[PDB]
Amino acid sequence: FDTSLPTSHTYLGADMEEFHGRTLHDDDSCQVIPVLPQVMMILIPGQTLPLQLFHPQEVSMVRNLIQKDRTFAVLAYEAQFGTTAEIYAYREEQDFGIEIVKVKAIGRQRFKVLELRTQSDGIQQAKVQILPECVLPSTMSAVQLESLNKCQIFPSKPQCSYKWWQKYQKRKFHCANLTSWPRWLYSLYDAETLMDRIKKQLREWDENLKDDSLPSNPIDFSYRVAACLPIDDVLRIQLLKIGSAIQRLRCELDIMNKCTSLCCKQCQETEITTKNEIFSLSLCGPMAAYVNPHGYVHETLTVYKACNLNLIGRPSTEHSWFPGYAWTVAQCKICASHIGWKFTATKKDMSPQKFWGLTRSALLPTIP
């Protein structure tokens, strides 16, 4: 299906302004930044966010920010934690009299609220400190035999994979015999092993290339994985609060292994989907972010099949995020709450021929 397309958000209109420079603040430094009111998602670093600015005041604020650092803040709602977002893609058409501004930004850093202030105009400012990003050394760097230090460097990585991993575990955690724990216990707090396990788990949701699809940095890999997990607002904010990369990787692995059921949020008991059916159609991952015609943001997850839903409306190709597909509104069979849409192709020779796109908000993970 050429999963590259959904990333580009071609439905915006293309011909988008591009910026090459980026700006990073200083860790623990206090900075004052404006907050857009419309945005409500819990942004994560490295995640792309599209937005449609309508109201004149926010349009003027965005226009001003263009020449400025091109950055603002999104509060993960009371507001205690938030994420800075740098705007990189900008466009304006002005058609229909109103100034319809289209923007795309990316998360940069995590901050905690220090003070929030409101101006007469209506926009809100906030002074906040930049939380640091901490990386721990190798767990075996404390206890070690210096003579064996020459054996830490391994030959380049290539049945065969299993043997190589066994040799890697046996050789790296040798000095573990000097402590009161076995090697397999230390292997559970290792970045490479957890990343490999997460790659194995993701391989069932896609046929992607391991080398290029995911980054080689533990922090970037952890944030990318976190950006594509169907979890609640509470779970996502709890993940965001975590400081160390190892803790975030362990939490992500635990969530993937344990949470298997996806139920209606409103009902809290009407089972909707199982993880086994989760499949990805966009390189961003199983779950992506899009914007509706009126600018509202929605996180959408693709699944082969669904259940306990009722269909209203008729198929329509207007403003469809997925090229060459229609949609019909899907409501919960019990509470009639919107859950998402059913996408059915109009041309044949498509893999798949139909599927469902469910919004993240209505989902609720459940552990059998």
Partner: peptide
Amino acid sequence: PFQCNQCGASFTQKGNLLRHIKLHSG
């Protein structure tokens, strides 16, 4: 003729869309 701004569903009665709006709201 009627249609919800948020979900995009199409309705016919004003009461239908009024009650629909409550589902995805505060």
